[PDB]
Symmetry: none
């Protein structure tokens, strides 16, 4: 069917590179999905120095930073 | 879910103090995960003058040498 690769990255705490529709890039460990204070759906990404709540509606791509069988680069919407 | 702190240390190239089950201590920068020539899973630790392939099965503890929001210490076994 249809795999939720965001959910799967969080389930396995995968290291990922996230690119936003703005073009900004973030690197870190996929921690969890949650809503931010604005009630927008987010992925919690634990980066080197801080954790970001990044809106899933604003994701352009998610890239694996490790070898695993699930994905290399996922391009969204 | 459970985090791979060896993977995360290498992802962010964290400075770490590694204590082996022998009691030997190594300091350096976490570089990469790879198998050694004996096919054992290792962390490549870049020391001051050389890089060591240290078996992950032989790790006792990994201590942070920098303040960061991932760990101060990880104990194995
Ligand atoms: Mg939205
Ligand atoms: Mg750094
Ligand atoms: Mg010296
Ligand atoms: Mg072994």
């Amino acid at each position: 069917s249809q795999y939720d690769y965001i959910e799967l990255a969080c389930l396995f705490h995968l290291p990922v590179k996230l690119t936003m529709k703005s073009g900004e890039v973030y690197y870190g460990v996929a921690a969890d999905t949650q809503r931010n204070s604005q009630k927008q759906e987010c992925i919690a990404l634990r980066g080197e120095e801080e954790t970001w709540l990044l809106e899933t509606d604003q994701l352009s791509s998610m890239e694996a930073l490790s070898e695993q069988p699930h994905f290399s680069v996922i391009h969204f919407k």
